[PDB]
Amino acid sequence: FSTAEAAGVKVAAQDGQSPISDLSVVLRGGSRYATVPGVSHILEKFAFQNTVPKSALRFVRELELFGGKLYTHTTREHIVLRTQFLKQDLPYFVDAFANVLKETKFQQFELTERVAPVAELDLLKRESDPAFTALEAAHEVAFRTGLGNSVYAQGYSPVTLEDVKEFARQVYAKQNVAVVGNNVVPADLQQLVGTAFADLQEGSKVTQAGTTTLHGGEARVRTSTGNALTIALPIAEPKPVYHALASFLGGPASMPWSVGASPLAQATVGTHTSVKATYHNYGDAGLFAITIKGDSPAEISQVAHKAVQALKDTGAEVTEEQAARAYAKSKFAAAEAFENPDSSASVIGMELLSGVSRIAPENVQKFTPAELSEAAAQLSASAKPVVAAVGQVHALPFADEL
Amino acid sequence: YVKKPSYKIVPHFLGFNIPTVSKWIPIFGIWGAAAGIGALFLIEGVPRTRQDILSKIPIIGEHWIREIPASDNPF
Missing domain, CATH: 3.30.830.10 (Metalloenzyme, LuxS/M16 peptidase-like)
Known part of the structure; x- marks a missing residue:
């Protein structure tokens, strides 16, 4: 992975010999940075909703024409948004990521009808495994806040549209974004990210509210x-x-x-x-x-x-x-x-x-x-x-x- | 490198488009034949149907050319 920089955004790519490219945007926006409990999970689920240039519906219909796939997940440290596509379709996917970071609409109806219900099914599926629950509970006891924040949105603490919009204002910024291209020509990615992510805010580095404290x-x-x-x-x-x-x-x-x-x-x-x-x-x-x-x-x-x-x-x-x-x-x-x-x-x-x-x-x-x-x-x-x-x-x- | 998917929107109306409708054109044809055969069959008894349509069909048409002898007809 040749690490470089394109218009203030850190870009790492590794060329390969495969017809399949993975492009991932890694955001410093995991749950240790969550302003409000569950907001990182909600922001992750808000990726590829309606943007100003392209609706969620239009994105999905076009993704199917490229046969691409979309994968997203939240950790304690990152939100990861990954697309998998044929090598040649790289420009489309770079532009789609740019639309998400610059121009997501964040509509109340999307939160109520689309994002929050999907977030809820995500968590219920994970909790079907009691070992997941046990390890999540253990982080909560051990760290309390920061690393102790829940990764996932829960019902008892509702995330509002204002919460998600504020968090996205911090996270979706040149300072909190890394682009990782697997089986992507490094010079080509730098050129594309340099044109697409040029007008993204610079913003500031997101930080953990408070120092990490350990507890038994x-x-x-x-x-x-x-x-x-x-x-x-x-x-x-x-x-x-x-x-x-x-x-x-x-x-x-x-x-x-x-x-x-x-x-x-x-x-x-x-x-x-x-x-x-x-x-x-x-x-x-x-x-x-x-x-x-x-x-x-x-x-x-x-x-x-x-x-x-x-x-x-x-x-x-x-x-x-x-x-x-x-x-x-x-x-x-x-x-x-x-x-x-x-x-x-x-x-x-x-x-x-x-x-x-x-x-x-x-x-x-x-x-x-x-x-x-x-x-x-x-x-x-x-x-x-x-x-x-x-x-x-x-x-x-x-x-x-x- | 491909920047955009390549597609157009075909003309459509009430959820129908020409590619789809064109597949059904033959089917309407057969249903029309079915309706035609059925309708004609229903009015086969009507004297005008026999006179104007059925008796004119070659070979078969003599099935519908029937005269009552004058000796057997009160009217």
């Missing part, structure tokens, strides 16, 4: 639709070793009809439960989480105890074999993330918008057993553990039990 605690989301438990540990100093540790502890099987050889995978033997360790770097803070879902609260409780034991055991001693296994699983995870278009866009988006150089998968550091055990030790001895229980909460573990 518990969340007990009572649902009737499945059971999950997250054990999270807020990290004050994000370090790359936690990726290796997440992949080491593991949890999912690398093989069909198996458990897996990872410590967390081996904690689920005899149970119909699954487990996943994840590490979330957010630049100024991090979150190390272990999420366990299952149909039995008793089995989840059983795994949860073994999971914290596994982390303590890791803090004691890792073997050289296990350290190498962690390097391999982590290098692989890095590679597939840089390949997947959604995650790719945000990785380079981070590099362009912030200044965090991407770590190439081939440059992923190998951590010694000493460095890994030290990382697990810090986590086992954390002063601020977070536990989010979802489902039959009366039957799930508490922080003080773990």
